[PDB]
Amino acid sequence: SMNLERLAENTGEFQEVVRAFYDTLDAARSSIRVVRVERVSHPLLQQQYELYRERLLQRCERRPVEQVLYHGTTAPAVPDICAHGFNRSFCNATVYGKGVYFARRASLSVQDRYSPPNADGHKAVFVARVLTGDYGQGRRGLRAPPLRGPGHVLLRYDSAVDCICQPSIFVIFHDTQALPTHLITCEHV
């Protein structure tokens, strides 16, 4: 909470982020209000992230290798994420693996079970760049992405998902594979 910077409502960056948030808010597009949007700066994690991104850009089948995704969290977790990035050791049921869950659609992250509100009724949703790369099928046992199986050089997939077909959830298992960029503070009207 020391490397957060509030964005004014009348700026390009605030509008990009908020528009993308409302576009994917579905069910609750008209119940949810935005209180605040803050830029997250973590120069070190960003460098560690860019190095991983270079390795994936050089060798992934799927495109894109990188996606913007939402992570709802508890008020107490906000300082840690801003200081350290996403920490899978805080693992709700780990249905698709013991990793950090990101959602394609904000509708999912903004639910009270993922972003529970605090005493002021404020809900914490992070926007993150995530190196999804080549994803495999998640399942509850997974302490890492699932094995690629025989005849692949790479031992494991980059991430795990609910469903390979149209995936809506990504589970990532490396501290450097997800960079928080913005903290959206929202509430139910």
Ligand X SMILES: O=c1[nH][nH]c(=O)c2cc(OCc3cccc(Cl)c3)ccc12
Q: Using CB under 6 A as the criterion, which residues of the chain lie in contact with ligand X when the complex forms?
A: 70-72, 92, 95, 101, 103, 108-109, 114, 162, 169
Strands, sheet with 66-73, edge to edge from the N-terminal-most edge strand? 4-6, 32-40, 178-188, 123-131, 66-73, 100-103, 169-172, 159-161, 135-137
Alpha-carbon distance of 183 to 78, in angstroms, equals 9
Q: How far is the CB of 56 from ligand X (least distance, A)?
A: 22
Q: Measured from the CB atom, is 93 or 153 closer to ligand X?
A: 93
Q: How far is the CB of 88 from ligand X (least distance, A)?
A: 10
Q: How far is the CB of 72 from ligand X (least distance, A)?
A: 4
Q: Measured from the CB atom, is 22 or 59 closer to ligand X?
A: 22
Q: Measured from the CB atom, is 95 or 154 closer to ligand X?
A: 95
Token pair of 120, please?
Answer: 């002021």
For the four alpha carbons of 156, 46, 105 and 60, in that order, the dihedral sign comes to negative
Q: Which residue is nearest to ligand X (CB)?
A: 109
